[PDB]
Design a protein around this ligand. Structure first.
Ligand SMILES: [Ca+2]
Ligand SMILES: [Ca+2]
Ligand SMILES: [Ca+2]
Ligand SMILES: [Ca+2]
Ligand SMILES: [Ca+2]
Ligand SMILES: [Ca+2]
Ligand code: NI
Lengths: 138, 138, 138, 138
């Protein structure tokens, strides 16, 4: 398992949407989705939202009016699984640094004093033992 | 109950703004604001800031002066309510992967000792009597 | 003050920069910098990186070769004090629903660490204080 | 050392890619790559993804079509090290507000007891010793 297990998926979301888009607009926007690699590129351009809509979608949408769904969806997914990936890093680097350290040091400072209390506790039975013997010898 | 509230609110924000956008720039910028389902797009584009001003606002404003406020305001709120939403995952993904798991494991370990330092404590008051029995009894 | 202090700072930064566009690209790029409320607008557009130099400072810089310094810096500063501000929100949001009231409940956990402890010791001394009345006899 | 370590890195790439990019495109795309000083510009114009494929890579690519690779890669890395760099600031600011400051408050309410109980303890022996000293007394 893991976090970069998304870098797997994203590039498959990609693979998917590329092939999907290529099958459609290969026909009539072979400028962009002429080929797979072409769609690949385009879709990374779209990933980046560098004229994503006016450049690509809207033209494509004029020809294929529903395409809006394709482009709008790809985006929400593309971006979403990046946000989902990017944060998995905020986390796996956030708590890589002072959060492994602390958990260990308090796992340590805590068993430090189940140590202290418990035995120090003991001398008190050892005392309720020495003294125990003496209300007897009273 | 939860953060889909911002989502909802931010989805409200769309509905709400796409609504006005439709009615106003409808007749002037009809590809952009003719039908709701096309101010929706256009706003989702505006949302993404993909040729947001030069493509849509400037022209909507080169005609309608106040529209600026419309677009600007939409953006600030749009982005802002996500920023708020985005972070609400950084946090809830942080207060889920890390901030929550010890929140339990430390009151889990604190009670382990108020039951032990207070357990200690009985013995110490109980040595108190067995001996307060001896300033007098022995 | 805090987050809202950068807020101010930035909006300072903005006015201070739309200040210049208007004093500066006014005669000539009046679509963008002709007057203030239009630099303001432009500046916000430029902030958000919608056609910022292709649309804007490439043709402004077809005007002035130095102007590049103008739009570039504005961004690196503009973007910069937001990153600074944004972060101040992950921070003052990330330690506000997860990390804030812990320091108060662990103020309080470490609080009885004295209450029990100190009162226990109190007993200890009193034990001794009487035991010592028994070096006195025995 | 610190993290400007990455500022170096990115800035090495920002330099490296413009030098690499003048070599190729200087010839035939002068307005963007016929120099370094405007390559740089362009490359930060590219850094930002303002008309990146559409404005630039595409027509450039049109000429040296494998130019995609240079744009795409640039971008993946340019961005990616700002991600590693931005994160740094998230962490070196989340590890600065409470991470560094609070860790110290705990060094203190940790070492407060190994001192408090040392002597709670201490008094426990003395007590034991007097009774232990009362074995060879009576
Ligand atoms: Ca073309
Ligand atoms: Ca149409
Ligand atoms: Ca005009
Ligand atoms: Ca011109
Ligand atoms: Ca403790
Ligand atoms: Ca454009
Ligand atoms: Ni913590």
């Amino acid at each position: 398992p893991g976090i970069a297990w998304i870098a797997l998926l994203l590039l498959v979301i990609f693979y998917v949407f590329a092939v999907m888009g290529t099958k459609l607009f290969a026909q009539s926007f072979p400028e962009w989705f002429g080929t797979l690699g072409a769609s690949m590129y385009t879709l990374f351009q779209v990933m980046t939202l560098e004229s994503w809509s006016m450049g690509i979608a809207r033209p494509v949408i004029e020809a294929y009016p529903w395409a809006w769904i394709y482009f709008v969806s790809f985006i929400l997914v593309s971006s979403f699984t990046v946000l989902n990936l990017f944060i998995g890093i905020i986390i796996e680097s956030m708590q890589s640094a002072h959060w492994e350290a602390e958990d260990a040091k308090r796992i340590e400072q805590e068993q430090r004093a189940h140590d202290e209390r418990l035995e120090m506790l003991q001398l008190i039975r050892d005392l309720s033992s020495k003294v125990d013997r003496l209300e007897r010898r009273s």
